[PDB]
Tab-separated table of C-alpha atoms in Angstrom:
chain	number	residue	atom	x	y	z
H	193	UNK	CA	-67.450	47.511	-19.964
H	194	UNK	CA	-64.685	49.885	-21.363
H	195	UNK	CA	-65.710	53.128	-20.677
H	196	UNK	CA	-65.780	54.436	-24.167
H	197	UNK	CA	-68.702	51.493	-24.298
H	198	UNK	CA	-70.854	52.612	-21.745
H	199	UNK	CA	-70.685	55.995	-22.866
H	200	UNK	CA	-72.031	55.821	-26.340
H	201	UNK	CA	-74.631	53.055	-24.963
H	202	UNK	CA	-76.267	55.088	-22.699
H	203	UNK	CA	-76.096	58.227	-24.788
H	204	UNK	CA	-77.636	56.186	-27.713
H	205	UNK	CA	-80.199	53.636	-26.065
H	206	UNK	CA	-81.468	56.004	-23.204
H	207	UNK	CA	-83.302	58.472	-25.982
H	208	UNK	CA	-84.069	55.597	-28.302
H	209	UNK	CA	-85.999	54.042	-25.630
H	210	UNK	CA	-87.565	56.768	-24.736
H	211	UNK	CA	-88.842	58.178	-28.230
H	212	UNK	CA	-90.211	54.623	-29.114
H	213	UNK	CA	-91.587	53.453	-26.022
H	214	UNK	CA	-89.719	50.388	-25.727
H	215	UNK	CA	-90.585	48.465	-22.368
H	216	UNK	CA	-87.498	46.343	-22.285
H	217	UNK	CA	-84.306	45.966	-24.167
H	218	UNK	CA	-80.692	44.163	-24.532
H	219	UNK	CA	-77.904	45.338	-26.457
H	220	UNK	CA	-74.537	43.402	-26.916
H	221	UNK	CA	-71.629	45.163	-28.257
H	222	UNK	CA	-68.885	42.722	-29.048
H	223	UNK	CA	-65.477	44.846	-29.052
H	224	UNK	CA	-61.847	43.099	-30.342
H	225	UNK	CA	-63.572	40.027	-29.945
H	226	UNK	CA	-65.145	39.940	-26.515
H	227	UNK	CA	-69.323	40.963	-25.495
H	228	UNK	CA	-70.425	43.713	-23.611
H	229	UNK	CA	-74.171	43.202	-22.643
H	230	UNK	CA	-76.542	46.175	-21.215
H	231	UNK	CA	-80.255	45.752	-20.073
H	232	UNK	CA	-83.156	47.563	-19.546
H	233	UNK	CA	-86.497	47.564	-18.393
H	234	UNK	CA	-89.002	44.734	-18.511
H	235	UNK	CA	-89.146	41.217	-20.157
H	236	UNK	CA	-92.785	41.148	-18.097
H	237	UNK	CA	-94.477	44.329	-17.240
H	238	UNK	CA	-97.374	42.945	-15.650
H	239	UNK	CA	-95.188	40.531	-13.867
H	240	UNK	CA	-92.373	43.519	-13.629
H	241	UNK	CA	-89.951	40.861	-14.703
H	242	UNK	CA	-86.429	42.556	-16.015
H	243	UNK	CA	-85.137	41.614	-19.099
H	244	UNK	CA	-81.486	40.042	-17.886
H	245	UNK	CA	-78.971	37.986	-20.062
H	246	UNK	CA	-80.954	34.828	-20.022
H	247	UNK	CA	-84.170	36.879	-21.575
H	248	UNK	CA	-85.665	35.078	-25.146
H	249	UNK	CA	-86.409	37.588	-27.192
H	250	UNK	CA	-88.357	36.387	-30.856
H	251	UNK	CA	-85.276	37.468	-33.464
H	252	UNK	CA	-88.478	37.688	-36.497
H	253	UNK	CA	-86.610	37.968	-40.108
H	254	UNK	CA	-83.244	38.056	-37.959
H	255	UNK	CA	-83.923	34.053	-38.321
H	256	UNK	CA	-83.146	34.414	-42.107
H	257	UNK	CA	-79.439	34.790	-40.864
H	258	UNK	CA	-79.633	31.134	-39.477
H	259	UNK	CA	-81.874	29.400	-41.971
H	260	UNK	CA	-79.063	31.135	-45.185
H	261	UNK	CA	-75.986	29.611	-42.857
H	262	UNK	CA	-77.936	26.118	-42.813
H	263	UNK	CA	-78.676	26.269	-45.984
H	264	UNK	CA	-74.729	27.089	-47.068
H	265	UNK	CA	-73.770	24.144	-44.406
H	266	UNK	CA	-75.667	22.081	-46.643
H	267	UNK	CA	-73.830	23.195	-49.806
H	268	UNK	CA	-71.133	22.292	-48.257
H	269	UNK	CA	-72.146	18.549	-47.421
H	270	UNK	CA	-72.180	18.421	-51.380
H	271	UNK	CA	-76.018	17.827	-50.064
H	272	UNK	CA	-77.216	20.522	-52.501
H	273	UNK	CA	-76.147	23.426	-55.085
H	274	UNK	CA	-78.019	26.548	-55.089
H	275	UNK	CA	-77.810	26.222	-59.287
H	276	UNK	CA	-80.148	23.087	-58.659
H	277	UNK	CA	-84.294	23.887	-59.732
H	278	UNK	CA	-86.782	24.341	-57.135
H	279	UNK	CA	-88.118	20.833	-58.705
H	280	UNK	CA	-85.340	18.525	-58.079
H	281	UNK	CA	-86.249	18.572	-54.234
H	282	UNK	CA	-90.288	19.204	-54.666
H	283	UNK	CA	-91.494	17.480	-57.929
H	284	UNK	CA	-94.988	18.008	-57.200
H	285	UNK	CA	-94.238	22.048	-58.516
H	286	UNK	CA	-95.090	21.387	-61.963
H	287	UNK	CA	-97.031	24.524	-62.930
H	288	UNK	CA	-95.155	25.795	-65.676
H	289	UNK	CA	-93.732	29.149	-63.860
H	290	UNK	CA	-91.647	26.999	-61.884
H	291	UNK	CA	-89.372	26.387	-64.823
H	292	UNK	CA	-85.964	28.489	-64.470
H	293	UNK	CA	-86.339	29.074	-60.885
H	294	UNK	CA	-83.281	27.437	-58.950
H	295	UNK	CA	-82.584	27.122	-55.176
H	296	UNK	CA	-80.151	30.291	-55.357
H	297	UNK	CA	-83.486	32.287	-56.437
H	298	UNK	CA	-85.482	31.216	-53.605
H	299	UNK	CA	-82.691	31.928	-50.594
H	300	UNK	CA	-82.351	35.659	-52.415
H	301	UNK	CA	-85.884	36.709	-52.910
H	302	UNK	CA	-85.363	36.837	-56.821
H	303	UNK	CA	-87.739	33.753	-57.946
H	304	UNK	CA	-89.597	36.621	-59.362
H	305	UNK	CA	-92.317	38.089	-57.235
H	306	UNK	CA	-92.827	35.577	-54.582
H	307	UNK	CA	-95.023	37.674	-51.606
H	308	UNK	CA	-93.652	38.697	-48.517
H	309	UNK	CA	-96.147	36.629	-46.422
H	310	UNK	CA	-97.407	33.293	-46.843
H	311	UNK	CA	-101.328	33.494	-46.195
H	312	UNK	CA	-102.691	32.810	-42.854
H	313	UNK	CA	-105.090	30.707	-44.159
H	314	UNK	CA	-102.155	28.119	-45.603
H	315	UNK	CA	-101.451	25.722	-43.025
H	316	UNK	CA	-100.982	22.559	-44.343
H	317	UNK	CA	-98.358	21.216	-46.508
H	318	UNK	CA	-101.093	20.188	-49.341
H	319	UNK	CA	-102.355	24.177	-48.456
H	320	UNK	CA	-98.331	25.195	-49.320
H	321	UNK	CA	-98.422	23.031	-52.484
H	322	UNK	CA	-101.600	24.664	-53.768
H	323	UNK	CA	-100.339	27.867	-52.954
H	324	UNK	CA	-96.849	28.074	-54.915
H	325	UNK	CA	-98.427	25.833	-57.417
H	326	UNK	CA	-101.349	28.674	-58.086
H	327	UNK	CA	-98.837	31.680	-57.512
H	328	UNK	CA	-97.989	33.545	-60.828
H	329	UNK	CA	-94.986	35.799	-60.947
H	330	UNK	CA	-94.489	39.242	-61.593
H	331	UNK	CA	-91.271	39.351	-63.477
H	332	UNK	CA	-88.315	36.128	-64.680
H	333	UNK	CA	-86.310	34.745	-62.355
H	334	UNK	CA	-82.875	35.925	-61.405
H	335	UNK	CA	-84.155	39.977	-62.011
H	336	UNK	CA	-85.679	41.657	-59.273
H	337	UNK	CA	-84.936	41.079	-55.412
H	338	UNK	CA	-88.289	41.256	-53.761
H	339	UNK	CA	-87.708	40.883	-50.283
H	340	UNK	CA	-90.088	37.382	-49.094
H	341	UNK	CA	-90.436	35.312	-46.408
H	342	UNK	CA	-92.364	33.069	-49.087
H	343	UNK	CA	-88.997	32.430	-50.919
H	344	UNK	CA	-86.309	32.276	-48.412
H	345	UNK	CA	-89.200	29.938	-46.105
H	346	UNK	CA	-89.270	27.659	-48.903
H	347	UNK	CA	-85.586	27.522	-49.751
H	348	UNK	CA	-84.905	26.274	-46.318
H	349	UNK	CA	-87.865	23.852	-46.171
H	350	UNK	CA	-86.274	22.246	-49.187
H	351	UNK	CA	-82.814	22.390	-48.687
H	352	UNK	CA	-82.880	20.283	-45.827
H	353	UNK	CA	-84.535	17.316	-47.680
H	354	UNK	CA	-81.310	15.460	-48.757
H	355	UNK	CA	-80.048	15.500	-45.072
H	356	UNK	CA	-83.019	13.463	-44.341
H	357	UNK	CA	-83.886	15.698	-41.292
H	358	UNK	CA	-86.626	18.334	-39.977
H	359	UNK	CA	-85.662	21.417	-40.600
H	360	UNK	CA	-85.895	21.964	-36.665
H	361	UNK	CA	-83.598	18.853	-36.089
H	362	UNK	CA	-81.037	20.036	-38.559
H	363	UNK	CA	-80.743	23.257	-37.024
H	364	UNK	CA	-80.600	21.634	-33.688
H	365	UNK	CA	-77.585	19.340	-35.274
H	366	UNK	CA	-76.158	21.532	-37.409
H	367	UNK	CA	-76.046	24.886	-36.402
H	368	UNK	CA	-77.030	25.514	-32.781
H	369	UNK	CA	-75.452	22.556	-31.223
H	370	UNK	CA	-71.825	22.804	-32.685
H	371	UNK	CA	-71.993	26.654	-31.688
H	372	UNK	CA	-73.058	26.237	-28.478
H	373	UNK	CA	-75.750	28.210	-28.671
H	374	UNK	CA	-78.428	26.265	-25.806
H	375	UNK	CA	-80.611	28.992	-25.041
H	376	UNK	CA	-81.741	29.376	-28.655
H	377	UNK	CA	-85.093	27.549	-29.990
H	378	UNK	CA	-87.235	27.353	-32.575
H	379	UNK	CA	-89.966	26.132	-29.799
H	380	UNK	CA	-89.068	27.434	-26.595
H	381	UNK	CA	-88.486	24.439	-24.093
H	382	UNK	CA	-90.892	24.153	-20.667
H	383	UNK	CA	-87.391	24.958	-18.639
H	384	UNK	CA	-87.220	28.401	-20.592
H	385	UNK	CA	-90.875	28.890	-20.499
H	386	UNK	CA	-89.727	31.492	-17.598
H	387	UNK	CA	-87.313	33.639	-19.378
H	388	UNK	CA	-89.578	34.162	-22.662
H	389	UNK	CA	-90.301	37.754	-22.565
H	390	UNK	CA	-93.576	39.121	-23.389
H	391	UNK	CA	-93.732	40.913	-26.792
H	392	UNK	CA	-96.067	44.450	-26.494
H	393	UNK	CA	-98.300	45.597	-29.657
H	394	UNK	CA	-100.684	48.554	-28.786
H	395	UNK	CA	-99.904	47.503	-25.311
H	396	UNK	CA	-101.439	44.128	-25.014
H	397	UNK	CA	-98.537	41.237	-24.665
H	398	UNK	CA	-98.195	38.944	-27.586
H	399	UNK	CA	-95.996	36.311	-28.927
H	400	UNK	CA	-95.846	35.163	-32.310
H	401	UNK	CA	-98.452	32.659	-33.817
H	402	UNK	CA	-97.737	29.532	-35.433
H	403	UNK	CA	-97.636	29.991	-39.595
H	404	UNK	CA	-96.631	28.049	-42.249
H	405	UNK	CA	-92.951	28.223	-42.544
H	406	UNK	CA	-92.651	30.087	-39.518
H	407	UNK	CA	-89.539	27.729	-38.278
H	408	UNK	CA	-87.217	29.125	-41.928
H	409	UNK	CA	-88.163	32.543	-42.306
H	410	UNK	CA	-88.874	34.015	-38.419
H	411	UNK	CA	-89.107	31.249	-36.167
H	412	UNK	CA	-86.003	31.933	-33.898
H	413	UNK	CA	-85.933	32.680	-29.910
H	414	UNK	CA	-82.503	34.146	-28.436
H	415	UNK	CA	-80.613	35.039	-25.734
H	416	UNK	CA	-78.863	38.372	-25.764
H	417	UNK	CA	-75.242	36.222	-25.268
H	418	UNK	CA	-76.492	33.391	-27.676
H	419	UNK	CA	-76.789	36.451	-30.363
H	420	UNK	CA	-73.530	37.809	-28.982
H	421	UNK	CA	-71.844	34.746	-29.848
H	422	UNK	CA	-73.487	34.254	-32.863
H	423	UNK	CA	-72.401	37.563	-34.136
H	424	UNK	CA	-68.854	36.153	-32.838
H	425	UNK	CA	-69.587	33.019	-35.038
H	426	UNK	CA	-70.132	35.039	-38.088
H	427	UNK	CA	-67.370	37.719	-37.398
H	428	UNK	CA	-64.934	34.945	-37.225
H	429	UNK	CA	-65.674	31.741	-38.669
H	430	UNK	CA	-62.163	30.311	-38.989
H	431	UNK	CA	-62.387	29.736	-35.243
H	432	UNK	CA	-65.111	27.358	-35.966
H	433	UNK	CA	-64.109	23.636	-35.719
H	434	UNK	CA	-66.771	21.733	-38.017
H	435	UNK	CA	-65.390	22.268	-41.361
H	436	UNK	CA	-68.909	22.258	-42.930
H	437	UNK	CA	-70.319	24.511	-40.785
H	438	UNK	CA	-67.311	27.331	-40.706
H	439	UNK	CA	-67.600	26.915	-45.005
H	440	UNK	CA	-71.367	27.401	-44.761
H	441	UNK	CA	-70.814	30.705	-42.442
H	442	UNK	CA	-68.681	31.848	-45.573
H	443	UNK	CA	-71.681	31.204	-48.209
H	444	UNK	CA	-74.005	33.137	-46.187
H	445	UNK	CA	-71.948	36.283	-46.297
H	446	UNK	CA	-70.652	35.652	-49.767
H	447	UNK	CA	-72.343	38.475	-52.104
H	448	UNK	CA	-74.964	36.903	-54.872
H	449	UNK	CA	-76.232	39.929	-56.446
H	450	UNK	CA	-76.116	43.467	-55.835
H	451	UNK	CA	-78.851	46.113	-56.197
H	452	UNK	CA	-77.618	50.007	-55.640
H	453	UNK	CA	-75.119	49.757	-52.841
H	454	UNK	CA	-76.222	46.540	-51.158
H	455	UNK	CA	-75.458	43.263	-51.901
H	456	UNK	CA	-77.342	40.339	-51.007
H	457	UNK	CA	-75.968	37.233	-49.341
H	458	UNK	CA	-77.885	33.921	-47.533
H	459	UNK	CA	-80.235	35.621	-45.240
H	460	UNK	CA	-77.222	38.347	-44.295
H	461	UNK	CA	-77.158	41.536	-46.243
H	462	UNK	CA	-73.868	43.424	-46.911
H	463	UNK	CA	-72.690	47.194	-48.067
H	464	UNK	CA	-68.416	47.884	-48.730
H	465	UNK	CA	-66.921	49.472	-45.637
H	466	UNK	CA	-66.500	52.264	-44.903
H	467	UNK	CA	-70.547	53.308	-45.625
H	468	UNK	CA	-72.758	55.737	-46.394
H	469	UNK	CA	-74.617	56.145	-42.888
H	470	UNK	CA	-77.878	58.237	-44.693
H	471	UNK	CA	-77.890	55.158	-47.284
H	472	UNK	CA	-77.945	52.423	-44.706
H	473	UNK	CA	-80.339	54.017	-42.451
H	474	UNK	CA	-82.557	55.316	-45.475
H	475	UNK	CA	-82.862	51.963	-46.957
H	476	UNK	CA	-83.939	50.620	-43.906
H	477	UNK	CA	-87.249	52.053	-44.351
H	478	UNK	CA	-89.605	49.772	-45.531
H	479	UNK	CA	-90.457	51.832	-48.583
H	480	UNK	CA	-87.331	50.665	-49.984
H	481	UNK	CA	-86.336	47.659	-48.136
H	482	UNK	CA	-89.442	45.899	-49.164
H	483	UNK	CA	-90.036	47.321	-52.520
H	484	UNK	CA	-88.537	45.041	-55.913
H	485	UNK	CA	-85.800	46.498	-57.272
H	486	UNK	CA	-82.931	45.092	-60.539
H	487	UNK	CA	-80.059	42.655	-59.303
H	488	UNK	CA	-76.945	43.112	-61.265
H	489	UNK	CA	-76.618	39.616	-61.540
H	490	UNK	CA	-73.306	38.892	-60.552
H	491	UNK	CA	-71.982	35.906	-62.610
H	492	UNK	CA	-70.255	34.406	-60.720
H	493	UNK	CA	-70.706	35.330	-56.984
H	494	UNK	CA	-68.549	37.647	-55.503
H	495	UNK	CA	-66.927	35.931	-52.224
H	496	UNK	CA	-67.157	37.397	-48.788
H	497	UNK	CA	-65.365	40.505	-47.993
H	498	UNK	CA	-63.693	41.216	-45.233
H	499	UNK	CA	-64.364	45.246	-45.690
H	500	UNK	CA	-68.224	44.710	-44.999
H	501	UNK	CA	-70.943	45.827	-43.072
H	502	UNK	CA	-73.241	42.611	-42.715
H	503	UNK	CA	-76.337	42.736	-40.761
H	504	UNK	CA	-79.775	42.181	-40.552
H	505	UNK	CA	-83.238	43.625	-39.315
H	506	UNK	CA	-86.315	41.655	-37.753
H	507	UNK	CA	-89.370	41.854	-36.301
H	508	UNK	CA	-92.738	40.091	-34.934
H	509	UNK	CA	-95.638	41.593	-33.638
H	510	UNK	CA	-94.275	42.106	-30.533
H	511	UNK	CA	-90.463	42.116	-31.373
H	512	UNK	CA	-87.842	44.033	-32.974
H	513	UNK	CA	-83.978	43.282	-33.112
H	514	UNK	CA	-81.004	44.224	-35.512
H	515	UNK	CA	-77.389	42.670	-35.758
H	516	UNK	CA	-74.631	44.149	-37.494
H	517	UNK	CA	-71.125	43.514	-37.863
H	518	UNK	CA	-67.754	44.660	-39.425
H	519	UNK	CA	-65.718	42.016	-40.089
H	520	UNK	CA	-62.266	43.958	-40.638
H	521	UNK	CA	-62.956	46.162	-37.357
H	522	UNK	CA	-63.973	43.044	-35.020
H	523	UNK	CA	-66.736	44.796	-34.243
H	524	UNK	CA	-70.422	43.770	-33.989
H	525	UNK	CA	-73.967	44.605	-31.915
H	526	UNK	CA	-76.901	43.057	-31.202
H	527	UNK	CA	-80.123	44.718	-30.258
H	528	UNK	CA	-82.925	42.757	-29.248
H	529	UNK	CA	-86.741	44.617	-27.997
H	530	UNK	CA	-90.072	43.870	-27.054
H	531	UNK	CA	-91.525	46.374	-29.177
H	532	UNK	CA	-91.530	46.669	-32.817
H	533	UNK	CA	-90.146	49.891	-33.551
H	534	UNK	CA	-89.147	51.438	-37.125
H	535	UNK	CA	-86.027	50.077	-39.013
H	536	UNK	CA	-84.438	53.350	-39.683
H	537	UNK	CA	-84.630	53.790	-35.385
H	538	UNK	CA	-82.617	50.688	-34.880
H	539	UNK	CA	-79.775	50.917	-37.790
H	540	UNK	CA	-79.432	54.994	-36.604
H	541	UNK	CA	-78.400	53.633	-33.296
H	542	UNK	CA	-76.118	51.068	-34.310
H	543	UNK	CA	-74.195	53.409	-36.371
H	544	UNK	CA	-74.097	55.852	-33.371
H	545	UNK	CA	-72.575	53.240	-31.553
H	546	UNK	CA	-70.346	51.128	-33.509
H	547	UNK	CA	-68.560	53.880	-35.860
H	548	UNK	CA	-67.761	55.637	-32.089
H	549	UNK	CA	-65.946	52.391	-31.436
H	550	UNK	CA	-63.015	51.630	-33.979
């Protein structure tokens, strides 16, 4: 790596691991256009297995990114609109809250109050039905952002209907496949069984457990240079061949509504460039980031911008990762852990790093 990269790395990630305990991390920094990739520590403590390159690390929410640019591939297969109802793909939702709520609503958490968690005791798809069909909403769609696995889950569940695949399969196809992105899974293969890091809660290694929706709203395993070159995919996506797929990149990032100084795309989130660093790192916190708050609708969407800070937080029980990138400065990072550690922690360090770096 440059020097000036290895410098602010180590400065930045040596504390951060420290202070939160982490037991193993990866960090990509992608600078003009190329990856730089730094490990530490363990993938497998008991097994004192480092994490390396090839480590899967569980992405959580981070899959939101992926299931909002499958979902914009999709509108733009003329497959679906995001101005279509909820009810044109799932007819069975005929309770009468369902009325007014439209595909763009779902993939933007503003359906109306739509919970952040899908019970554990749903399972089954007649479970799912029951459950949206006996929800009641806390305020008319298109007002509040309410940030839900419940609604962007379901928007990708249903947007994949007219393509007559899985939603698995049309990630497979779609997404990871024309990207060339084969150490990524939503079920990690026997071949990779090896490379799966352990995720550590209180200690005791965990990986996530199957849930309903699990596959659209936090399903993803990745490789530290799978999410290096999906951060290049999204930096860049005129480099992208499939027409469909580079248009789709576009949507994700393209801003529906905004609510203070943040704007919401498809699974991305975006702020104007230059930021407010105190803002960014404040609203991390999940006093604010999952708390409802007024969408100025913006009629009609504002495209991408250039002049952006996109990214994204996640986390499992065992997991916690970030991606951000600045489109204008071709700059991006991705930082992956085995420990869930506070959002503020994690968007702190990525400023440190990438504002040192333009």
């Amino acid at each position: 790596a440059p020097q000036q990269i290895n410098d602010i790395v180590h400065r930045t990630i040596t504390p951060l691991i420290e202070q939160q305990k982490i037991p193993g991390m990866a960090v990509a920094v992608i600078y003009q256009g190329k990856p730089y990739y730094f490990t530490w520590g363990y993938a497998d403590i008991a097994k004192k297995q480092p994490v390396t390159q090839q480590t899967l690390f569980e992405l959580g929410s981070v899959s939101k990114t992926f299931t909002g640019v499958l979902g914009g591939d999709a509108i733009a297969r003329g497959e679906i609109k995001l101005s279509d109802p909820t009810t044109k793909y799932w007819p069975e939702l005929t309770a009468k809250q369902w009325n007014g709520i439209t595909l763009l609503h779902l993939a933007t958490y503003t359906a109306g109050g739509l919970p952040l968690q899908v019970p554990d005791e749903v399972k089954s798809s007649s479970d799912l039905l029951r459950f949206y069909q006996n929800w009641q909403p806390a305020w008319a769609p298109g007002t509040q952002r309410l940030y839900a696995g419940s609604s962007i889950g379901l928007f990708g569940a249903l947007a994949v209907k007219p393509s007559g695949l899985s939603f698995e399969q049309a990630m497979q196809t779609r997404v990871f496949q024309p990207l060339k992105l084969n150490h990524t899974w939503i079920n990690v293969p026997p071949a990779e069984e090896k490379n799966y890091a352990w995720g550590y809660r209180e200690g005791k290694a965990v990986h996530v457990s199957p849930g309903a929706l699990d596959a659209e709203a936090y399903g993803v395993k990745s490789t530290i240079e799978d999410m290096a070159r999906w951060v290049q995919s999204n930096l860049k996506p005129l480099d992208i061949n499939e027409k469909t797929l580079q248009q789709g990149i576009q949507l994700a990032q393209s801003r529906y509504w905004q609510t203070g100084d943040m704007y919401q795309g498809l699974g991305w989130e975006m702020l104007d460039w230059p930021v407010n660093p105190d803002s960014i790192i404040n609203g991390s916190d999940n006093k604010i980031a999952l708390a409802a708050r007024p969408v100025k609708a913006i009629t009609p969407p504002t495209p991408a911008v250039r002049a952006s800070w996109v990214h994204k937080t996640g986390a499992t029980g065992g997991f916690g990762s970030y991606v951000a990138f600045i489109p204008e400065k071709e700059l991006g990072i991705v930082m992956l852990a085995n420990k869930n550690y506070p959002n503020p922690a994690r968007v702190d360090a990525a400023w440190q790093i990438l504002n040192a770096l333009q």
